Amino acid sequence: PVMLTPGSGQFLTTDDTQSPSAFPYFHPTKEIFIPGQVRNLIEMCQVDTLIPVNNTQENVRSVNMYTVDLRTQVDLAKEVFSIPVDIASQPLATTLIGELASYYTHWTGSLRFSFMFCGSASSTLKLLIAYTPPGVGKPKSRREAMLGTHLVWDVGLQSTASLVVPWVSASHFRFTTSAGYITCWYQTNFVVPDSTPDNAKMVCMVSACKDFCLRLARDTNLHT
Amino acid sequence: PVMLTPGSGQFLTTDDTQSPSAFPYFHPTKEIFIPGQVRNLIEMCQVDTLIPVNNTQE
Amino acid sequence: IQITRGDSTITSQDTANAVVAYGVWPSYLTPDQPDTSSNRFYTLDSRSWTSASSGWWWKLPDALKNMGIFGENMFYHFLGRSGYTIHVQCNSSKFHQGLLIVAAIPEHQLASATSGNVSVGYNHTHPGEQGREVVNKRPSDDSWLNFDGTLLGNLPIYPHQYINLRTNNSATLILPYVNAVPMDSMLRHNNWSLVIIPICPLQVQPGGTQSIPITVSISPMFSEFSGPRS
Amino acid sequence: IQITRGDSTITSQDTANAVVAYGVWPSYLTPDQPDTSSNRFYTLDSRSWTSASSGWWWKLPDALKNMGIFGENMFYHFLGRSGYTIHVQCNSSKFHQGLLIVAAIPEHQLASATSGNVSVGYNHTHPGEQGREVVNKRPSDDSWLNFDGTLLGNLPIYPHQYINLRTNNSATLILPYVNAVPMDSMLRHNNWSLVIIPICPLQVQPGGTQSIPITVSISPMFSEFSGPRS
Amino acid sequence: TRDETSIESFLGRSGCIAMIEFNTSGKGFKTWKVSLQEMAQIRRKYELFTYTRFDSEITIVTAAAAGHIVLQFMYVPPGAPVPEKRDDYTWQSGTNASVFWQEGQPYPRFTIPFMSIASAYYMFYDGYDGDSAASKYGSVVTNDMGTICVRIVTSNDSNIVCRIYHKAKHIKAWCPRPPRAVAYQHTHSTNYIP
Amino acid sequence: TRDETSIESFLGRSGCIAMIEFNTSGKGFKTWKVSLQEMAQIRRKYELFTYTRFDSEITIVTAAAAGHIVLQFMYVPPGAPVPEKRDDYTWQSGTNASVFWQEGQPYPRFTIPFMSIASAYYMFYDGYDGDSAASKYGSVVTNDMGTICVRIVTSNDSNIVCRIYHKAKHIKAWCPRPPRAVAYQHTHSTNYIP
């Protein structure tokens, strides 16, 4: 004695019932050990990938989109670069973390940004790397950036610098379509001895921290 | 071996069966504490409210 | 007696008779903070209650956006959170009479004064420390409809106290932070509205003072902010 | 310091700072082996890195098919298996600058340089010890698309190290055997591709050496073969 | 006694919150953005509270008039793309929940979880989507609950009506409010003037 | 928390991987070689990995237009002979898995085991079927998953459309890869140029 109830005989595409094996007696090929098993996408989000910071129409078809120019022949009052911290938008959107977050509606947790200087061992320079919180508005000068959260990075002493931007929003998650700005400024002119390139390149990278989380999966035409 | 019985396949609007989640793997946003939770309407009935005794068209 | 918070001091004997909204004391957010430099009493300009008055309202935190350290913290952080102590005092003679309801309404989403699907405009819903004294994107004047299409006789369902001029010259409301998120934009959204409405209008005979002052003092409580900027 | 395997010896102080691909050390196949006569370092002809260079790639085991005992074992057995140590060295002055990514890609199935459903030809995917230096069945030249339609900024998801000429002149990758079968045809299929791409191009002033050598040394590790023939 | 005045009893009774209708001969699909504000009798009960949280059980009662018809009912969650055409890519997305139902089968039923990024739905919201004079005010700013989409799967002159019955489940409610004293004029708005 | 980024959550959601259509009046049957490469949105998610292993659950949503129609759906495993005609011997073979389904019955469902002679499917394969200049390269060499075959069993003017919904189950994935940055041109190929 049974009653079927209003869900009976549906194909709900998200259901999780048992179903008959088409091939009993068949034993699948034994699962051997293969290196590099992935159990969660958050393992992939934790890898540092290059930010295409140098988005200009001459560079976007090439390796040059990843490298920021540092040079002697410059207006030292201008920003070196700026990165909006939202993984929803350029330049972060095509990084591995921006790509994995594009499969989800909601994201949360801390982002690690890393910067690598690629000038000679004889090249020296100070850069000021500043984080500006959401809603504060991007700094207009090196002095304004220095009054905020910042690192004065001597690239002569340290070839790499890092910044961890913690989660800061009213809700425990935010949609994947502000988080603030990272901005870079000259603290000094570019210093070199003779017979040394008077310019260099810097590479910017992003990854998730161990607290990172994605929620509410979605599929959309962000790839055709 | 089952028999369906005369109620089978009804949509009774007052029924209380289980039904499938449309979104397994989704975890809802955590329930934070919010002041002033109501569990029963009789909590609201116990509040003193003004009587409109002076019902005249003016 | 005397009540002191930060460098601010106010005098009232009634302070122990406060209404705690929903029975919940304000508190700092749990693991699942500027203190007394922020958490002063800010005393607004006193309202003139007269026999003609329809009532007054203020929105929180909006009424404090220009008020010292707390007002600066609302611009210099992305998200914020606070409770409030609201103290309302209404000094009068033994020969004045009148009844106020003093109520705090969570999410007091105002109706317009107009018939369309038109929203109330931001300039009207953010009046600041002056509030609105009740008389096409302007809010309702119907204090008898709570400015939102609900009857004034049912306003006591909200956290409230009466000021009955023969009995008590003051009311105190203690408001916890009330929202569906732990912290929120202090400038786009108001957690609470303070509403003061005369149920029984002011009466006094000629030669008595025809206006009595309503003085509103608001202290932030357990204020918290995140996303600091210079 | 000095590293010795078989009758081969190479010099480098960086050897303890190797990246082990997927955290898995190479090993012999479990119950569910020629040793050091096979498992030498084979040092390829050095690449000339210049400001014009687009990068280089090699396929494994293909780059070793002509290399001594290991190369003979790939022809004289039906199926084979190995890990690798790849050591990449890049000697330069203090006045040179540039950044390489050195990456190992499992199953690096190349795209063609053409619009049809046409496959990359066997002659192009098996370049041997010379590799391909990047400039109708030929592979893609787009190192910025990883020759496979994926962005170069995302290449660090693979086992990789950087060579930044100011910091380090070398990289070491330890590669386990990676396949969906225990052993496979060493001549029809490549388990790994070594990819070396300049992220920041070489710069040096005139009168400095305009080409810097990239020297690749590959040792088989835990090599195993089956179906022996004379 | 007095379980019939519990919030689960008062808010958690099934009701027809929407009435999808469409014809076939683009065209052969319809969509409805999910809200409790459409029907005054449902809306008034939820608006006795400032915040509410519930999962919701959808049951779709379908009638049709010119073999047996096949329909796809699709739930599109908050912030996902809604169908623009009868055979758009959105109907194939494994991130949407679809139930395929065929005529004379028991009516389709599914539960959507509490979907919101906030910990409860705002019945009222004293704030804005932004700083502008054009910015929306009130409970339309918050509370995207998702969209229900319907298409005919069958190849061809027919009229289809779907009653969307909704039952809130595991209900919590906060900060009680005066009952609505005057007629509702528009969805999400507190406006009352004729 | 974070179960929604598990590989079972990310790869293991049901999606329409194929769209069998045929007419009747030879002719009255259709076949489809099973692969995940047909639909770009499905393909891109599997191609984040170098190897994957799963059982797969097939659900077939059928619509038809001119008594109730009877269909035979047949799974032909890797390396078994595929039908050449509507009443070929292959439809009677007890080594193929068949489900007979009749119109208005709940949609047919079955799980195929992981069928491959290798321990996982190759999403990418850096090798050949043989030594020749004509030899295939890439993940078309490996990964015969089998063929889905459909015929009408009924004696006679009708059009039939079958949506093959596929859910991967008990999923394992290895060696993560950069996401596909540019459009897919052809099945199993990494080619990208317009």
JSON list of N, CA, C and O in Angstrom, two decimals, chain D residues 59 106-107 109-112 116 118 120-121 125 137 140 142 148-149 158 179-180 188-190, chain F residues 50-51 119 122 124-128 133 137-139 177-178 180-181 186 188 190-192 194:
[
{"chain": "D", "resi": 59, "resn": "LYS", "atom": "N", "xyz": [59.98, 16.93, -26.44]},
{"chain": "D", "resi": 59, "resn": "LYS", "atom": "CA", "xyz": [59.06, 15.89, -26.00]},
{"chain": "D", "resi": 59, "resn": "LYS", "atom": "C", "xyz": [59.84, 14.73, -25.40]},
{"chain": "D", "resi": 59, "resn": "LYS", "atom": "O", "xyz": [60.93, 14.42, -25.86]},
{"chain": "D", "resi": 106, "resn": "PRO", "atom": "N", "xyz": [52.28, 17.37, -19.00]},
{"chain": "D", "resi": 106, "resn": "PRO", "atom": "CA", "xyz": [51.89, 16.01, -19.33]},
{"chain": "D", "resi": 106, "resn": "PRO", "atom": "C", "xyz": [50.92, 16.02, -20.51]},
{"chain": "D", "resi": 106, "resn": "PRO", "atom": "O", "xyz": [50.05, 16.88, -20.56]},
{"chain": "D", "resi": 107, "resn": "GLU", "atom": "N", "xyz": [51.02, 15.08, -21.44]},
{"chain": "D", "resi": 107, "resn": "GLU", "atom": "CA", "xyz": [50.12, 15.00, -22.62]},
{"chain": "D", "resi": 107, "resn": "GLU", "atom": "C", "xyz": [49.97, 16.35, -23.35]},
{"chain": "D", "resi": 107, "resn": "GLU", "atom": "O", "xyz": [48.87, 16.88, -23.53]},
{"chain": "D", "resi": 109, "resn": "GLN", "atom": "N", "xyz": [49.41, 17.72, -26.18]},
{"chain": "D", "resi": 109, "resn": "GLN", "atom": "CA", "xyz": [48.82, 17.52, -27.50]},
{"chain": "D", "resi": 109, "resn": "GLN", "atom": "C", "xyz": [48.76, 18.85, -28.27]},
{"chain": "D", "resi": 109, "resn": "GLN", "atom": "O", "xyz": [47.88, 19.69, -28.05]},
{"chain": "D", "resi": 110, "resn": "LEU", "atom": "N", "xyz": [49.69, 19.05, -29.20]},
{"chain": "D", "resi": 110, "resn": "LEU", "atom": "CA", "xyz": [49.86, 20.31, -29.93]},
{"chain": "D", "resi": 110, "resn": "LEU", "atom": "C", "xyz": [48.68, 20.63, -30.86]},
{"chain": "D", "resi": 110, "resn": "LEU", "atom": "O", "xyz": [48.17, 19.75, -31.54]},
{"chain": "D", "resi": 111, "resn": "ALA", "atom": "N", "xyz": [48.30, 21.90, -30.93]},
{"chain": "D", "resi": 111, "resn": "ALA", "atom": "CA", "xyz": [47.44, 22.42, -31.99]},
{"chain": "D", "resi": 111, "resn": "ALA", "atom": "C", "xyz": [48.25, 22.62, -33.28]},
{"chain": "D", "resi": 111, "resn": "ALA", "atom": "O", "xyz": [49.44, 22.91, -33.22]},
{"chain": "D", "resi": 112, "resn": "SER", "atom": "N", "xyz": [47.62, 22.53, -34.46]},
{"chain": "D", "resi": 112, "resn": "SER", "atom": "CA", "xyz": [48.27, 22.92, -35.72]},
{"chain": "D", "resi": 112, "resn": "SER", "atom": "C", "xyz": [48.33, 24.44, -35.91]},
{"chain": "D", "resi": 112, "resn": "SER", "atom": "O", "xyz": [47.62, 25.20, -35.25]},
{"chain": "D", "resi": 116, "resn": "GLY", "atom": "N", "xyz": [41.76, 24.01, -40.29]},
{"chain": "D", "resi": 116, "resn": "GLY", "atom": "CA", "xyz": [40.99, 22.78, -40.47]},
{"chain": "D", "resi": 116, "resn": "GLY", "atom": "C", "xyz": [41.00, 21.83, -39.27]},
{"chain": "D", "resi": 116, "resn": "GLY", "atom": "O", "xyz": [41.66, 22.07, -38.26]},
{"chain": "D", "resi": 118, "resn": "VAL", "atom": "N", "xyz": [42.66, 19.22, -39.38]},
{"chain": "D", "resi": 118, "resn": "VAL", "atom": "CA", "xyz": [43.93, 18.56, -39.70]},
{"chain": "D", "resi": 118, "resn": "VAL", "atom": "C", "xyz": [44.80, 18.40, -38.45]},
{"chain": "D", "resi": 118, "resn": "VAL", "atom": "O", "xyz": [45.04, 19.35, -37.72]},
{"chain": "D", "resi": 120, "resn": "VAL", "atom": "N", "xyz": [48.38, 17.53, -36.27]},
{"chain": "D", "resi": 120, "resn": "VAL", "atom": "CA", "xyz": [49.83, 17.76, -36.37]},
{"chain": "D", "resi": 120, "resn": "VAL", "atom": "C", "xyz": [50.53, 16.45, -36.80]},
{"chain": "D", "resi": 120, "resn": "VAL", "atom": "O", "xyz": [50.24, 15.39, -36.25]},
{"chain": "D", "resi": 121, "resn": "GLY", "atom": "N", "xyz": [51.42, 16.51, -37.79]},
{"chain": "D", "resi": 121, "resn": "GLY", "atom": "CA", "xyz": [52.10, 15.34, -38.35]},
{"chain": "D", "resi": 121, "resn": "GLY", "atom": "C", "xyz": [53.21, 14.76, -37.46]},
{"chain": "D", "resi": 121, "resn": "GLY", "atom": "O", "xyz": [53.84, 15.50, -36.71]},
{"chain": "D", "resi": 125, "resn": "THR", "atom": "N", "xyz": [55.82, 16.45, -34.43]},
{"chain": "D", "resi": 125, "resn": "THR", "atom": "CA", "xyz": [55.68, 16.14, -33.00]},
{"chain": "D", "resi": 125, "resn": "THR", "atom": "C", "xyz": [56.81, 15.28, -32.43]},
{"chain": "D", "resi": 125, "resn": "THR", "atom": "O", "xyz": [56.90, 15.14, -31.22]},
{"chain": "D", "resi": 137, "resn": "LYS", "atom": "N", "xyz": [50.48, 20.63, -41.79]},
{"chain": "D", "resi": 137, "resn": "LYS", "atom": "CA", "xyz": [50.44, 19.73, -40.62]},
{"chain": "D", "resi": 137, "resn": "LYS", "atom": "C", "xyz": [51.45, 20.10, -39.52]},
{"chain": "D", "resi": 137, "resn": "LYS", "atom": "O", "xyz": [51.72, 19.29, -38.64]},
{"chain": "D", "resi": 140, "resn": "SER", "atom": "N", "xyz": [51.40, 24.84, -33.90]},
{"chain": "D", "resi": 140, "resn": "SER", "atom": "CA", "xyz": [51.31, 26.26, -33.54]},
{"chain": "D", "resi": 140, "resn": "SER", "atom": "C", "xyz": [52.66, 26.87, -33.13]},
{"chain": "D", "resi": 140, "resn": "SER", "atom": "O", "xyz": [53.47, 26.24, -32.46]},
{"chain": "D", "resi": 142, "resn": "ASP", "atom": "N", "xyz": [52.32, 29.89, -31.39]},
{"chain": "D", "resi": 142, "resn": "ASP", "atom": "CA", "xyz": [51.81, 30.80, -30.35]},
{"chain": "D", "resi": 142, "resn": "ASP", "atom": "C", "xyz": [52.19, 30.32, -28.94]},
{"chain": "D", "resi": 142, "resn": "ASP", "atom": "O", "xyz": [51.41, 29.68, -28.24]},
{"chain": "D", "resi": 148, "resn": "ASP", "atom": "N", "xyz": [48.59, 25.28, -27.72]},
{"chain": "D", "resi": 148, "resn": "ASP", "atom": "CA", "xyz": [47.44, 24.39, -27.52]},
{"chain": "D", "resi": 148, "resn": "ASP", "atom": "C", "xyz": [46.12, 25.14, -27.23]},
{"chain": "D", "resi": 148, "resn": "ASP", "atom": "O", "xyz": [45.09, 24.51, -26.97]},
{"chain": "D", "resi": 149, "resn": "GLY", "atom": "N", "xyz": [46.12, 26.47, -27.35]},
{"chain": "D", "resi": 149, "resn": "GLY", "atom": "CA", "xyz": [44.93, 27.31, -27.17]},
{"chain": "D", "resi": 149, "resn": "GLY", "atom": "C", "xyz": [44.67, 27.69, -25.71]},
{"chain": "D", "resi": 149, "resn": "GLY", "atom": "O", "xyz": [43.52, 27.93, -25.34]},
{"chain": "D", "resi": 158, "resn": "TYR", "atom": "N", "xyz": [51.02, 23.77, -14.39]},
{"chain": "D", "resi": 158, "resn": "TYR", "atom": "CA", "xyz": [51.92, 22.65, -14.59]},
{"chain": "D", "resi": 158, "resn": "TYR", "atom": "C", "xyz": [53.14, 22.70, -13.66]},
{"chain": "D", "resi": 158, "resn": "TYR", "atom": "O", "xyz": [53.52, 23.79, -13.22]},
{"chain": "D", "resi": 179, "resn": "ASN", "atom": "N", "xyz": [50.93, 8.58, -16.84]},
{"chain": "D", "resi": 179, "resn": "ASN", "atom": "CA", "xyz": [50.13, 7.98, -17.90]},
{"chain": "D", "resi": 179, "resn": "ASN", "atom": "C", "xyz": [48.91, 7.27, -17.27]},
{"chain": "D", "resi": 179, "resn": "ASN", "atom": "O", "xyz": [48.94, 6.91, -16.10]},
{"chain": "D", "resi": 180, "resn": "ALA", "atom": "N", "xyz": [47.87, 7.00, -18.05]},
{"chain": "D", "resi": 180, "resn": "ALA", "atom": "CA", "xyz": [46.71, 6.21, -17.62]},
{"chain": "D", "resi": 180, "resn": "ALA", "atom": "C", "xyz": [46.89, 4.69, -17.79]},
{"chain": "D", "resi": 180, "resn": "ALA", "atom": "O", "xyz": [45.95, 3.93, -17.53]},
{"chain": "D", "resi": 188, "resn": "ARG", "atom": "N", "xyz": [55.55, 5.86, -30.02]},
{"chain": "D", "resi": 188, "resn": "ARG", "atom": "CA", "xyz": [54.27, 6.44, -30.50]},
{"chain": "D", "resi": 188, "resn": "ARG", "atom": "C", "xyz": [53.73, 7.56, -29.62]},
{"chain": "D", "resi": 188, "resn": "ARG", "atom": "O", "xyz": [52.84, 8.28, -30.06]},
{"chain": "D", "resi": 189, "resn": "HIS", "atom": "N", "xyz": [54.16, 7.65, -28.37]},
{"chain": "D", "resi": 189, "resn": "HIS", "atom": "CA", "xyz": [53.54, 8.50, -27.35]},
{"chain": "D", "resi": 189, "resn": "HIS", "atom": "C", "xyz": [54.56, 9.18, -26.44]},
{"chain": "D", "resi": 189, "resn": "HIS", "atom": "O", "xyz": [55.50, 8.55, -25.96]},
{"chain": "D", "resi": 190, "resn": "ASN", "atom": "N", "xyz": [54.38, 10.47, -26.17]},
{"chain": "D", "resi": 190, "resn": "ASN", "atom": "CA", "xyz": [55.22, 11.24, -25.26]},
{"chain": "D", "resi": 190, "resn": "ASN", "atom": "C", "xyz": [54.49, 11.57, -23.97]},
{"chain": "D", "resi": 190, "resn": "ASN", "atom": "O", "xyz": [53.45, 12.22, -23.98]},
{"chain": "F", "resi": 50, "resn": "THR", "atom": "N", "xyz": [43.90, 16.39, -17.35]},
{"chain": "F", "resi": 50, "resn": "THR", "atom": "CA", "xyz": [44.59, 15.58, -18.36]},
{"chain": "F", "resi": 50, "resn": "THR", "atom": "C", "xyz": [43.96, 14.20, -18.49]},
{"chain": "F", "resi": 50, "resn": "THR", "atom": "O", "xyz": [43.74, 13.71, -19.59]},
{"chain": "F", "resi": 51, "resn": "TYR", "atom": "N", "xyz": [43.62, 13.60, -17.35]},
{"chain": "F", "resi": 51, "resn": "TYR", "atom": "CA", "xyz": [42.95, 12.31, -17.28]},
{"chain": "F", "resi": 51, "resn": "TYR", "atom": "C", "xyz": [41.72, 12.44, -16.40]},
{"chain": "F", "resi": 51, "resn": "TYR", "atom": "O", "xyz": [41.75, 13.14, -15.39]},
{"chain": "F", "resi": 119, "resn": "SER", "atom": "N", "xyz": [43.34, 2.74, -17.50]},
{"chain": "F", "resi": 119, "resn": "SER", "atom": "CA", "xyz": [42.78, 3.02, -16.17]},
{"chain": "F", "resi": 119, "resn": "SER", "atom": "C", "xyz": [42.05, 4.36, -16.02]},
{"chain": "F", "resi": 119, "resn": "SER", "atom": "O", "xyz": [41.36, 4.55, -15.02]},
{"chain": "F", "resi": 122, "resn": "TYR", "atom": "N", "xyz": [41.80, 9.63, -21.45]},
{"chain": "F", "resi": 122, "resn": "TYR", "atom": "CA", "xyz": [42.71, 10.69, -21.86]},
{"chain": "F", "resi": 122, "resn": "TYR", "atom": "C", "xyz": [41.91, 11.88, -22.36]},
{"chain": "F", "resi": 122, "resn": "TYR", "atom": "O", "xyz": [41.33, 11.83, -23.43]},
{"chain": "F", "resi": 124, "resn": "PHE", "atom": "N", "xyz": [43.55, 14.55, -23.16]},
{"chain": "F", "resi": 124, "resn": "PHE", "atom": "CA", "xyz": [44.60, 14.89, -24.11]},
{"chain": "F", "resi": 124, "resn": "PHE", "atom": "C", "xyz": [45.53, 13.69, -24.25]},
{"chain": "F", "resi": 124, "resn": "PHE", "atom": "O", "xyz": [45.72, 12.95, -23.30]},
{"chain": "F", "resi": 125, "resn": "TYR", "atom": "N", "xyz": [46.11, 13.51, -25.43]},
{"chain": "F", "resi": 125, "resn": "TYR", "atom": "CA", "xyz": [47.00, 12.39, -25.71]},
{"chain": "F", "resi": 125, "resn": "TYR", "atom": "C", "xyz": [48.10, 12.82, -26.67]},
{"chain": "F", "resi": 125, "resn": "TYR", "atom": "O", "xyz": [47.84, 13.13, -27.83]},
{"chain": "F", "resi": 126, "resn": "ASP", "atom": "N", "xyz": [49.33, 12.90, -26.20]},
{"chain": "F", "resi": 126, "resn": "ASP", "atom": "CA", "xyz": [50.45, 13.37, -27.02]},
{"chain": "F", "resi": 126, "resn": "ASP", "atom": "C", "xyz": [51.10, 12.21, -27.79]},
{"chain": "F", "resi": 126, "resn": "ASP", "atom": "O", "xyz": [52.24, 11.81, -27.55]},
{"chain": "F", "resi": 127, "resn": "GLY", "atom": "N", "xyz": [50.33, 11.59, -28.68]},
{"chain": "F", "resi": 127, "resn": "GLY", "atom": "CA", "xyz": [50.74, 10.41, -29.42]},
{"chain": "F", "resi": 127, "resn": "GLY", "atom": "C", "xyz": [49.78, 9.98, -30.52]},
{"chain": "F", "resi": 127, "resn": "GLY", "atom": "O", "xyz": [48.77, 10.63, -30.76]},
{"chain": "F", "resi": 128, "resn": "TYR", "atom": "N", "xyz": [50.11, 8.87, -31.17]},
{"chain": "F", "resi": 128, "resn": "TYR", "atom": "CA", "xyz": [49.51, 8.43, -32.43]},
{"chain": "F", "resi": 128, "resn": "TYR", "atom": "C", "xyz": [48.89, 7.03, -32.37]},
{"chain": "F", "resi": 128, "resn": "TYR", "atom": "O", "xyz": [49.29, 6.20, -31.56]},
{"chain": "F", "resi": 133, "resn": "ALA", "atom": "N", "xyz": [51.92, 8.99, -41.90]},
{"chain": "F", "resi": 133, "resn": "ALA", "atom": "CA", "xyz": [51.53, 10.40, -42.07]},
{"chain": "F", "resi": 133, "resn": "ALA", "atom": "C", "xyz": [50.00, 10.62, -42.00]},
{"chain": "F", "resi": 133, "resn": "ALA", "atom": "O", "xyz": [49.54, 11.73, -41.71]},
{"chain": "F", "resi": 137, "resn": "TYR", "atom": "N", "xyz": [46.21, 11.75, -34.34]},
{"chain": "F", "resi": 137, "resn": "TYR", "atom": "CA", "xyz": [46.91, 12.31, -33.19]},
{"chain": "F", "resi": 137, "resn": "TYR", "atom": "C", "xyz": [45.88, 12.77, -32.16]},
{"chain": "F", "resi": 137, "resn": "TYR", "atom": "O", "xyz": [44.80, 13.24, -32.54]},
{"chain": "F", "resi": 138, "resn": "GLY", "atom": "N", "xyz": [46.18, 12.68, -30.88]},
{"chain": "F", "resi": 138, "resn": "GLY", "atom": "CA", "xyz": [45.31, 13.22, -29.84]},
{"chain": "F", "resi": 138, "resn": "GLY", "atom": "C", "xyz": [44.26, 12.27, -29.29]},
{"chain": "F", "resi": 138, "resn": "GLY", "atom": "O", "xyz": [44.23, 11.08, -29.60]},
{"chain": "F", "resi": 139, "resn": "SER", "atom": "N", "xyz": [43.38, 12.80, -28.44]},
{"chain": "F", "resi": 139, "resn": "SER", "atom": "CA", "xyz": [42.42, 12.02, -27.64]},
{"chain": "F", "resi": 139, "resn": "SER", "atom": "C", "xyz": [41.34, 11.26, -28.42]},
{"chain": "F", "resi": 139, "resn": "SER", "atom": "O", "xyz": [40.52, 10.57, -27.82]},
{"chain": "F", "resi": 177, "resn": "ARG", "atom": "N", "xyz": [45.11, 21.45, -15.84]},
{"chain": "F", "resi": 177, "resn": "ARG", "atom": "CA", "xyz": [45.56, 22.12, -17.05]},
{"chain": "F", "resi": 177, "resn": "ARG", "atom": "C", "xyz": [45.02, 23.54, -17.10]},
{"chain": "F", "resi": 177, "resn": "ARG", "atom": "O", "xyz": [43.96, 23.81, -16.52]},
{"chain": "F", "resi": 178, "resn": "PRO", "atom": "N", "xyz": [45.68, 24.48, -17.78]},
{"chain": "F", "resi": 178, "resn": "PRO", "atom": "CA", "xyz": [45.12, 25.79, -18.04]},
{"chain": "F", "resi": 178, "resn": "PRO", "atom": "C", "xyz": [43.75, 25.68, -18.73]},
{"chain": "F", "resi": 178, "resn": "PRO", "atom": "O", "xyz": [43.57, 24.82, -19.60]},
{"chain": "F", "resi": 180, "resn": "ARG", "atom": "N", "xyz": [40.88, 26.45, -21.47]},
{"chain": "F", "resi": 180, "resn": "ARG", "atom": "CA", "xyz": [40.81, 26.80, -22.89]},
{"chain": "F", "resi": 180, "resn": "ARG", "atom": "C", "xyz": [40.52, 28.30, -23.06]},
{"chain": "F", "resi": 180, "resn": "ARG", "atom": "O", "xyz": [39.47, 28.77, -22.63]},
{"chain": "F", "resi": 181, "resn": "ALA", "atom": "N", "xyz": [41.43, 29.04, -23.68]},
{"chain": "F", "resi": 181, "resn": "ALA", "atom": "CA", "xyz": [41.36, 30.50, -23.79]},
{"chain": "F", "resi": 181, "resn": "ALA", "atom": "C", "xyz": [40.66, 31.02, -25.05]},
{"chain": "F", "resi": 181, "resn": "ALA", "atom": "O", "xyz": [40.27, 32.18, -25.12]},
{"chain": "F", "resi": 186, "resn": "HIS", "atom": "N", "xyz": [36.98, 21.99, -33.64]},
{"chain": "F", "resi": 186, "resn": "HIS", "atom": "CA", "xyz": [36.65, 20.60, -34.01]},
{"chain": "F", "resi": 186, "resn": "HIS", "atom": "C", "xyz": [36.76, 19.66, -32.80]},
{"chain": "F", "resi": 186, "resn": "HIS", "atom": "O", "xyz": [37.52, 19.93, -31.87]},
{"chain": "F", "resi": 188, "resn": "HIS", "atom": "N", "xyz": [37.83, 16.50, -30.38]},
{"chain": "F", "resi": 188, "resn": "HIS", "atom": "CA", "xyz": [39.13, 15.92, -29.97]},
{"chain": "F", "resi": 188, "resn": "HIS", "atom": "C", "xyz": [40.42, 16.72, -30.29]},
{"chain": "F", "resi": 188, "resn": "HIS", "atom": "O", "xyz": [41.45, 16.51, -29.65]},
{"chain": "F", "resi": 190, "resn": "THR", "atom": "N", "xyz": [42.98, 20.06, -30.45]},
{"chain": "F", "resi": 190, "resn": "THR", "atom": "CA", "xyz": [43.32, 21.33, -29.77]},
{"chain": "F", "resi": 190, "resn": "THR", "atom": "C", "xyz": [43.39, 22.53, -30.72]},
{"chain": "F", "resi": 190, "resn": "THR", "atom": "O", "xyz": [43.63, 23.64, -30.25]},
{"chain": "F", "resi": 191, "resn": "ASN", "atom": "N", "xyz": [43.13, 22.38, -32.03]},
{"chain": "F", "resi": 191, "resn": "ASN", "atom": "CA", "xyz": [43.15, 23.48, -33.01]},
{"chain": "F", "resi": 191, "resn": "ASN", "atom": "C", "xyz": [42.21, 24.63, -32.61]},
{"chain": "F", "resi": 191, "resn": "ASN", "atom": "O", "xyz": [41.13, 24.40, -32.06]},
{"chain": "F", "resi": 192, "resn": "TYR", "atom": "N", "xyz": [42.62, 25.87, -32.87]},
{"chain": "F", "resi": 192, "resn": "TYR", "atom": "CA", "xyz": [41.90, 27.08, -32.44]},
{"chain": "F", "resi": 192, "resn": "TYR", "atom": "C", "xyz": [41.71, 28.16, -33.52]},
{"chain": "F", "resi": 192, "resn": "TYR", "atom": "O", "xyz": [40.84, 29.01, -33.37]},
{"chain": "F", "resi": 194, "resn": "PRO", "atom": "N", "xyz": [40.43, 30.30, -36.53]},
{"chain": "F", "resi": 194, "resn": "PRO", "atom": "CA", "xyz": [39.14, 30.39, -37.23]},
{"chain": "F", "resi": 194, "resn": "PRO", "atom": "C", "xyz": [39.13, 29.77, -38.63]},
{"chain": "F", "resi": 194, "resn": "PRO", "atom": "O", "xyz": [39.95, 30.13, -39.49]}
]
